[PDB]
Design an enzyme around this catalytic site. Structure first.
Site, mmCIF file in Angstrom:
data_model
loop_
_atom_site.group_PDB
_atom_site.id
_atom_site.type_symbol
_atom_site.label_atom_id
_atom_site.label_comp_id
_atom_site.label_asym_id
_atom_site.label_seq_id
_atom_site.Cartn_x
_atom_site.Cartn_y
_atom_site.Cartn_z
ATOM 1 N N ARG A 167 -25.737 77.248 -0.812
ATOM 2 C CA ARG A 167 -25.320 75.857 -0.952
ATOM 3 C C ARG A 167 -25.010 75.434 -2.381
ATOM 4 O O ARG A 167 -24.488 74.329 -2.566
ATOM 5 C CB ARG A 167 -26.376 74.927 -0.365
ATOM 6 C CG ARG A 167 -26.279 74.805 1.139
ATOM 7 C CD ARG A 167 -27.341 73.865 1.647
ATOM 8 N NE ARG A 167 -28.679 74.453 1.509
ATOM 9 C CZ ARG A 167 -29.804 73.764 1.656
ATOM 10 N NH1 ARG A 167 -29.748 72.465 1.907
ATOM 11 N NH2 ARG A 167 -30.989 74.358 1.519
ATOM 12 N N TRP A 174 -18.339 83.684 1.519
ATOM 13 C CA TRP A 174 -18.348 85.103 1.231
ATOM 14 C C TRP A 174 -19.750 85.652 1.513
ATOM 15 O O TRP A 174 -20.737 84.915 1.541
ATOM 16 C CB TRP A 174 -17.922 85.364 -0.208
ATOM 17 C CG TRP A 174 -18.704 84.608 -1.214
ATOM 18 C CD1 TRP A 174 -19.949 84.917 -1.675
ATOM 19 C CD2 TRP A 174 -18.299 83.423 -1.912
ATOM 20 N NE1 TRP A 174 -20.347 83.997 -2.608
ATOM 21 C CE2 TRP A 174 -19.352 83.070 -2.776
ATOM 22 C CE3 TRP A 174 -17.145 82.629 -1.895
ATOM 23 C CZ2 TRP A 174 -19.290 81.958 -3.611
ATOM 24 C CZ3 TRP A 174 -17.088 81.526 -2.723
ATOM 25 C CH2 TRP A 174 -18.157 81.195 -3.565
ATOM 26 N N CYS A 203 -29.155 77.319 4.722
ATOM 27 C CA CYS A 203 -28.090 77.998 3.981
ATOM 28 C C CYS A 203 -28.501 78.240 2.535
ATOM 29 O O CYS A 203 -28.768 77.289 1.795
ATOM 30 C CB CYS A 203 -26.788 77.194 4.019
ATOM 31 S SG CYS A 203 -25.509 77.969 3.037
ATOM 32 N N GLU A 221 -26.736 90.421 4.697
ATOM 33 C CA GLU A 221 -26.207 90.081 6.014
ATOM 34 C C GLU A 221 -25.611 91.303 6.697
ATOM 35 O O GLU A 221 -25.831 91.525 7.893
ATOM 36 C CB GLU A 221 -25.160 88.960 5.893
ATOM 37 C CG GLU A 221 -25.753 87.631 5.441
ATOM 38 C CD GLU A 221 -24.713 86.509 5.324
ATOM 39 O OE1 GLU A 221 -24.391 85.883 6.354
ATOM 40 O OE2 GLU A 221 -24.251 86.235 4.193
HETATM 41 C C1 HEM Z 1 -20.231 80.643 -0.108
HETATM 42 C C2 HEM Z 1 -21.028 81.641 0.267
HETATM 43 C C3 HEM Z 1 -22.104 81.472 1.365
HETATM 44 C C4 HEM Z 1 -23.163 82.283 1.470
HETATM 45 C C5 HEM Z 1 -23.520 83.467 0.530
HETATM 46 C C6 HEM Z 1 -23.953 81.847 2.605
HETATM 47 C C7 HEM Z 1 -25.122 82.450 3.018
HETATM 48 C C8 HEM Z 1 -25.812 82.122 4.156
HETATM 49 C C9 HEM Z 1 -26.815 82.935 4.823
HETATM 50 C C10 HEM Z 1 -27.300 84.342 4.400
HETATM 51 C C11 HEM Z 1 -27.256 82.249 5.872
HETATM 52 C C12 HEM Z 1 -28.311 82.755 6.866
HETATM 53 C C13 HEM Z 1 -27.553 83.117 8.135
HETATM 54 C C14 HEM Z 1 -28.045 84.414 8.711
HETATM 55 O O1 HEM Z 1 -28.730 85.183 7.993
HETATM 56 O O2 HEM Z 1 -27.736 84.678 9.901
HETATM 57 C C15 HEM Z 1 -26.534 80.981 5.937
HETATM 58 C C16 HEM Z 1 -26.711 79.984 6.872
HETATM 59 C C17 HEM Z 1 -25.865 78.906 7.018
HETATM 60 N N1 HEM Z 1 -24.740 78.649 6.252
HETATM 61 FE FE1 HEM Z 1 -24.224 79.397 4.457
HETATM 62 N N2 HEM Z 1 -23.331 80.749 3.190
HETATM 63 C C18 HEM Z 1 -22.167 80.489 2.456
HETATM 64 C C19 HEM Z 1 -21.257 79.486 2.737
HETATM 65 C C20 HEM Z 1 -21.315 78.518 3.720
HETATM 66 C C21 HEM Z 1 -20.312 77.494 4.042
HETATM 67 C C22 HEM Z 1 -18.924 77.380 3.348
HETATM 68 C C23 HEM Z 1 -20.802 76.750 5.054
HETATM 69 C C24 HEM Z 1 -20.200 75.533 5.781
HETATM 70 C C25 HEM Z 1 -19.167 74.821 5.283
HETATM 71 C C26 HEM Z 1 -22.140 77.270 5.363
HETATM 72 C C27 HEM Z 1 -23.029 76.818 6.303
HETATM 73 C C28 HEM Z 1 -24.184 77.460 6.724
HETATM 74 C C29 HEM Z 1 -25.006 76.979 7.799
HETATM 75 C C30 HEM Z 1 -24.749 75.695 8.613
HETATM 76 C C31 HEM Z 1 -26.012 77.840 7.991
HETATM 77 C C32 HEM Z 1 -27.146 77.653 9.031
HETATM 78 C C33 HEM Z 1 -26.978 78.436 10.327
HETATM 79 C C34 HEM Z 1 -28.052 77.971 11.303
HETATM 80 O O3 HEM Z 1 -28.514 76.783 11.257
HETATM 81 O O4 HEM Z 1 -28.455 78.801 12.158
HETATM 82 N N3 HEM Z 1 -22.395 78.317 4.534
HETATM 83 N N4 HEM Z 1 -25.658 80.943 4.868
HETATM 84 C C1 LIG Z 2 -28.235 83.326 15.540
HETATM 85 N N1 LIG Z 2 -27.555 84.039 14.449
HETATM 86 C C2 LIG Z 2 -26.499 84.899 15.011
HETATM 87 C C3 LIG Z 2 -26.969 83.037 13.545
HETATM 88 C C4 LIG Z 2 -25.885 83.653 12.663
HETATM 89 C C5 LIG Z 2 -25.281 82.557 11.821
HETATM 90 C C6 LIG Z 2 -25.023 81.309 12.381
HETATM 91 C C7 LIG Z 2 -24.469 80.297 11.601
HETATM 92 F F1 LIG Z 2 -24.214 79.086 12.120
HETATM 93 C C8 LIG Z 2 -24.182 80.518 10.271
HETATM 94 F F2 LIG Z 2 -23.642 79.523 9.534
HETATM 95 C C9 LIG Z 2 -24.449 81.760 9.717
HETATM 96 C C10 LIG Z 2 -24.133 81.999 8.272
HETATM 97 C C11 LIG Z 2 -23.094 83.098 8.225
HETATM 98 C C12 LIG Z 2 -22.391 82.908 6.916
HETATM 99 C C13 LIG Z 2 -21.473 81.871 6.770
HETATM 100 C C14 LIG Z 2 -20.821 81.709 5.560
HETATM 101 C C15 LIG Z 2 -21.123 82.596 4.529
HETATM 102 C C16 LIG Z 2 -22.055 83.613 4.720
HETATM 103 N N2 LIG Z 2 -22.341 84.465 3.714
HETATM 104 N N3 LIG Z 2 -22.673 83.754 5.904
HETATM 105 C C17 LIG Z 2 -24.993 82.785 10.482
#
Ligand code: HEM
Ligand SMILES: CN(C)CCc1cc(F)c(F)c(CCc2cccc(N)n2)c1
Ligand code: HEM
Ligand SMILES: CN(C)CCc1cc(F)c(F)c(CCc2cccc(N)n2)c1
Ligand SMILES: C[C@H](O)[C@H](O)[C@H]1CNc2nc(N)[nH]c(=O)c2N1
Ligand SMILES: C[C@H](O)[C@H](O)[C@H]1CNc2nc(N)[nH]c(=O)c2N1
Ligand SMILES: [Zn+2]
Lengths: 416, 414
Positions: free
Chosen positions: A116, A285, A113, A290
């Protein structure tokens, strides 16, 4: 034993001791790296009292360290209380304070993430008194209202009852709370979001009347206490949407594109002190890429690259004209501009990665490390002109954590 | 244990068994992944008489299999022959055919290289009879001219004498045969290529008279048999260069940019059958993004995004305008346009990654797998619109191999 990482653009070196506190396995060995495997069995997902108390104890030790009460009588009595609850009831219940700490720290430990930096400013909604699908729909509507906040988005998570015997699970069958439908046509083309064709079919089979449009919000499909899941339609006034236009290209609006404002993941598993929370939707947000890079331009999603490149009149014969790269930048300019114009929170990938570097450096200072998955942290466009591309990163698994879990329709036992 | 890799764009699944032949180590454990560390200890690099023979045996065993003579008269004979030479001389010498095989397979096994579909076409130049820096200079000039080939680039490696005791190493002190110089200005900033500032100073600190331009080709600094190295100017007529212009923006040529056509890495260590070749310059042809994204736009390199964007009159006051991304595309369109106009071989990142997917498919079909380092195979722009982004890759270390090695000026008893 200490470990160092180097930012090769700034020569900053940092020292990681936090990986020592790591228990869970990565998937790699000394002879093979699985760093690019998307769903390694280790990151995916019932427990017995045998292994549950040490997991409780390690979590409680962390918790009371964080509040400067390690070894206190409050700390020892809680350990005793949890013990007896485990031996006589086979599980245990977290206090409110512990649940909030846990959810925050699962996000803190989310090594993939990039957002964070915000981890301590998370709104935690305790839905552990919930018993029915209707009860779930109510908690989710309130999450969406609070998180959306008329466009001034707020991070939130809602936590439904923990798993007990694995036969009474709470699950949100959607992968995200808000997603667009996808429809396979008889001629082979796809209408709407191709990522959602399978889930759209399940909804239709459970009785959803589909409008069969290109941007239909899907219904909620909600499973309480292991019962069969039920359909509910989010009230449209709660679903904030942004029509996509471009600040120079007047013809861009005519592509009829829109996207929703709230990214809310709903299929992941929250693990806290050995307890498994199988329904735990969370939301933040959007980072601009994305939507603009993955959602619209992946060959297996909306795949609008060609339509955009046509209307820009690019040399689309040879790829070495980089028409694909050029259409992509414009689509991402449009997504950012539409959101900002409508005062809906969004962050670009330059801002978000700079913030993550500051977050990561601070985490090394005050915590001794920050687990990071370079493969996921680096943005899907313009990688090397963002500072994370030049940043060495150590990936390891800490708890509390978010884990993947199997899609419920492959494991559910149907009542009828 | 017979592992699988999925492509998530296409659902194609390949099964990898080649990894079970992996010998060396990755740096990862099951408790921590080092996949983003640029240089772990393992990727960097004498032999006791004992550890040398098992290495020789393993290499000869795979050599004779590749020619379908495993367990044949010739196999065991060569095996005994190398055995005897090691017992006596405490080293051994590769046959011509083994040297060629070992070099092609060091490239075949280079998990960070996206251009490996061309691996079997390599031209190997045996320079093991070389004894002096002047001879080294002669082999390198001949390499450059052969590989350049008037812009119809051809892959080549030149292999200098193998390490013996570590006191008489052959080393090319340049990181590439052809690189531009870099000077630190009185006012703090840097003129030319910042990556080369220390080396540019070592050359001057050695005797080079720098023209102190922005694109001054560096002299060669060649060290034979552990001696002090010597400066040599590569003949200009052998250094093919491309002036950079844009197919739409006439103001682009005013920027005064050029790049050289020949990418020729010269500071790595080639390891075959346990023998160490510390001087083995190799060359191919550029992928467009190496120049346009990294060389030109890295903040710690030429860092020209500021200028291109201004001359494009883009709103550079908010990052959310994506002006860096927008300029970045135009630069990379220009680099490809310039090379293709001057008929110098170059490949765009879409083509190379598509070819690498095809190469993976071939390697999984005929070899059982293909070591691949995702962090390095995915291009530094437009990552997810190339097919390697959605490709799961297994990274493991096979041998023969190219390894990193300490910079000579930190090691040499000057
Ligand atoms: C506040 C703004 C946030 C932004 C901009 C953000 C951004 C991102 C992005 C771009 C990814 C990559 C996912 C993808 O590209 O498919 C990601 C992954 C992830 N985000 Fe964040 N996120 C945010 C908030 C949060 C919150 C509130 C949580 C949980 C309470 C969280 C938990 C995670 C987790 C667990 C992943 C990993 C997904 C995996 O293991 O496949 N995020 N985030
Ligand atoms: C396999 N692929 C579809 C994974 C997609 C995927 C799986 C997740 F668990 C995950 F947390 C997020 C992040 C999406 C997200 C969450 C909060 C904010 C943000 N800006 N974006 C994205
Ligand atoms: C013929 C066209 C070739 C192309 C297009 C190509 C492309 C690339 C690229 C883009 C990289 C990434 C490194 C960076 O971005 O700095 C790379 C790495 C590498 N290439 Fe290739 N290459 C080619 C030929 C060769 C040849 C002929 C050899 C040796 C025989 C070779 C060996 C390597 C090695 C060893 C690495 C990685 C070094 C490391 O492990 O860090 N390549 N290549
Ligand atoms: C981290 N960085 C300093 C390492 C630089 C580096 C080390 C290498 F061994 C290496 F092969 C290349 C790729 C250069 C190259 C070679 C052949 C063709 C091509 N198109 N390009 C780049
Ligand atoms: C195969 C590869 O691991 C897969 O495509 C990953 C690569 N990196 C990613 N990075 C992010 N942020 N999101 C993703 O979905 C992916 N997909
Ligand atoms: C820190 C990180 O490992 C470093 O920036 C790597 C990332 N990926 C790369 N990929 C390529 N092709 N070339 C590089 O120099 C790097 N550098
Ligand atoms: Zn790893």
């Amino acid at each position: 034993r200490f470990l160092k990482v180097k930012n090769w653009e700034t020569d900053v070196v940092l020292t990681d001791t936090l990986h020592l506190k790591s228990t869970l396995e990565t998937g790699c060995t000394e002879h093979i790296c699985m760093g690019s495997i998307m769903l390694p069995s280790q990151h995916t997902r019932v427990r017995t009292k045998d292994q549950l108390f040490p997991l409780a104890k390690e979590f409680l030790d962390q918790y009371y360290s964080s509040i400067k009460r390690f070894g206190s009588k409050a700390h020892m009595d809680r350990l005793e209380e949890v013990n007896k609850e485990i031996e006589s009831t086979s599980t245990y219940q977290l206090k409110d304070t512990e649940l909030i700490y846990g959810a925050k720290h699962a996000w803190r430990n989310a090594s993939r993430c990039v957002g964070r930096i915000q981890w301590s400013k998370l709104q935690v909604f305790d839905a552990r008194d919930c018993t029915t699908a209707h009860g779930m729909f109510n908690y989710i509507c309130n999450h969406v209202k609070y998180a959306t906040n008329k466009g001034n988005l707020r991070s939130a998570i809602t936590i439904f009852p923990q798993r007990t015997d694995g036969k009474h699970d709470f699950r949100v069958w959607n992968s995200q709370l808000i997603r667009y439908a996808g429809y396979k046509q008889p001629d082979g083309s796809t209408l709407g979001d191709p990522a959602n064709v399978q889930f759209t079919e399940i909804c239709i089979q459970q009785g959803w009347k589909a409008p069969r449009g290109r941007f239909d919000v899907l219904p909620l499909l909600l499973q309480a206490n292991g019962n069969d899941p039920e359909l509910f339609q989010i009230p449209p006034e709660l679903v904030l949407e942004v029509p996509i236009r471009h600040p120079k290209f007047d013809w861009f609006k005519d592509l009829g594109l829109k996207w929703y404002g709230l990214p809310a993941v709903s299929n992941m598993l929250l693990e806290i002190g050995g307890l498994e929370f199988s329904a735990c939707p969370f939301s933040g947000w959007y980072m601009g890429t994305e939507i603009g890079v993955r959602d619209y331009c992946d060959n297996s999603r909306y795949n609008i690259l060609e339509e955009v490149a046509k209307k820009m009149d690019l040399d689309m014969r040879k790829t070495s004209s980089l028409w694909k790269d050029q259409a992509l930048v414009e689509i991402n300019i449009a997504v950012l501009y539409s959101f900002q114009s409508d005062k809906v929170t969004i962050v670009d990938h330059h801002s978000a990665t700079e913030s993550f570097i500051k977050h990561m450096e601070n985490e090394y200072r005050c915590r001794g490390g920050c687990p990071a998955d370079w493969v996921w942290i680096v943005p899907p466009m313009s990688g090397s002109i963002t500072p994370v591309f030049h940043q060495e990163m150590l990936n390891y698994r800490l708890t509390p954590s978010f884990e993947y879990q199997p899609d419920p329709w492959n494991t559910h036992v149907w009542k009828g």
